[PDB]
């Protein structure tokens, strides 16, 4: 409510820009919503959805995770630490999903989009599982432009939360794929300074980060506290004016506030 809105508003003033939060404690049904229905640029948070879409093709017997994908240097875009090592041998869809999630590998993400029907295909998938809000329009790296007032390549914290819940806890995917997406997000290496840094120590998190222009910094996660039902958390921020270290701190702090209020 208003008291809590004041706190998130103080963060927005502190860092500049615009902050969105949706959190849901599945064990009590309590939620936190701040700009939860406003659009924010997804940046790399879509890569979890891209992997999901590949898994959904496998569930439907139309695809195999072992299938080897060949690619060239014409496919390499910036920030592709994993794929930039396997041009010669190629990589499997499993390896590409893992790389896109755990290392936010841009080239791997574009490759997943290839096998999925592109941004329009990924969006189509999202509609198929009840997400009528989230939209991907472009490929890496252009999708990170994060232009103010631009609806392309956006979600809302509430839509992304609902979607992540369906994918990781609901029945949008088979048990095997759901478990596989779960393992990948838990194995993320890019999220240490963000949601993970704001939560109490013993809480297990699977997450996917995002970084983009106009000072965009995001993180979406499922959280498994000991002896409790899981929490779904989507945090988006854009437009802030702060260094890399403190954009990280903005997200961690919002996460910390959430754990106190939820």
Instruction: Give the active site residues.
Output: 44
Residues 18-47 close enough to bind Na ion by CB under 5 A: 43-44
Here the tokens at position 139 are: 């490929």
SS (H, E, C) the chain: CHHHHHHHHHHHHHHCCEEEEEEEECCCCCEEEECCCCCEECHHHHHHHHHHHHHHHHHCCCCCCCCEECCCCCCCCCCCCCHHHCCCCCEEHHHHHHHHHHCCCHHHHHHHHHHHCHHHHHHHHHHHCCCCCCCCCCCCCHHHCCCCCCCCCEECHHHHHHHHHHHHCCCCCCHHHHHHHHHHHHCCCCCCCCHHHHCCCCCEEEEEEEEECCCEEEEEEEEECCCCCCEEEEEEEECCCCCHHHHHHHHHHHHHHHHHHC
Smaller CB distance to Na ion: residue 178 or 193? 193
Smaller CB distance to Na ion: residue 32 or 108? 108
CB of residue 212 vs Na ion: minimum separation in angstroms? 6
CB of residue 43 vs Na ion: minimum separation in angstroms? 4
Binding mask 192-231 for Na ion (x = CB under 5 A): ------------------xx--------------------
Residue number of the CB closest to Na ion reads 44
CB of residue 42 vs Na ion: minimum separation in angstroms? 9
Residue count at the site for Na ion (CB under 5 A)? Answer: 4
Smaller CB distance to Na ion: residue 44 or 107? 44
Smaller CB distance to Na ion: residue 144 or 163? 144
CB of residue 72 vs Na ion: minimum separation in angstroms? 23
What is the C-alpha separation between 254 and 141, in angstroms, rounded? 27
Smaller CB distance to Na ion: residue 32 or 194? 194
Residues found near Na ion in the complex (CB under 5 A):
43-44, 210-211
């Amino acid at each position: 409510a208003a008291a809590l809105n004041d706190e998130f508003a103080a963060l927005e003033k502190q860092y500049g820009g615009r902050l969105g939060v949706y959190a849901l404690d599945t064990g009590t049904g309590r939620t936190i919503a701040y700009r939860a229905d406003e659009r924010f640029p997804m940046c790399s948070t879509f890569k979890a959805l891209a992997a999901a879409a590949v898994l959904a093709q496998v569930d439907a017997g139309k695809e195999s995770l072992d299938r080897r994908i060949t690619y060239t240097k014409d496919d390499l875009v910036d920030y592709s630490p994993v794929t930039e090592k396997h041009v010669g041998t190629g990589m499997t869809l499993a390896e590409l999903c893992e790389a896109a999630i755990t290392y936010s590998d841009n080239t791997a993400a574009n490759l997943l989009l290839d096998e999925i029907g592109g941004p329009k295909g990924l969006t189509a998938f999202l509609r198929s599982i009840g997400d009528d809000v989230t939209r991907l329009d472009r490929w890496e790296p252009e999708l990170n432009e994060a232009l103010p007032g631009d609806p392309r390549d956006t979600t809302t914290p509430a839509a992304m939360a609902a979607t992540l819940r369906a994918l990781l806890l609901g029945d949008a995917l088979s048990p095997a794929s759901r478990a596989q997406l779960t393992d990948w997000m838990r194995g993320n290496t890019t999220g240490d300074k963000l949601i993970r840094a704001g939560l109490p120590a013993g809480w297990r998190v699977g997450d996917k980060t995002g970084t983009g222009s106009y000072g965009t910094r995001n993180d979406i996660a499922i959280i498994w506290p000991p002896n409790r039902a899981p929490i779904v958390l989507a945090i988006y921020s854009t437009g802030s004016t702060a260094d890399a270290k403190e954009r990280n701190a903005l997200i961690a702090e919002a996460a910390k506030i959430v754990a106190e209020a939820l």
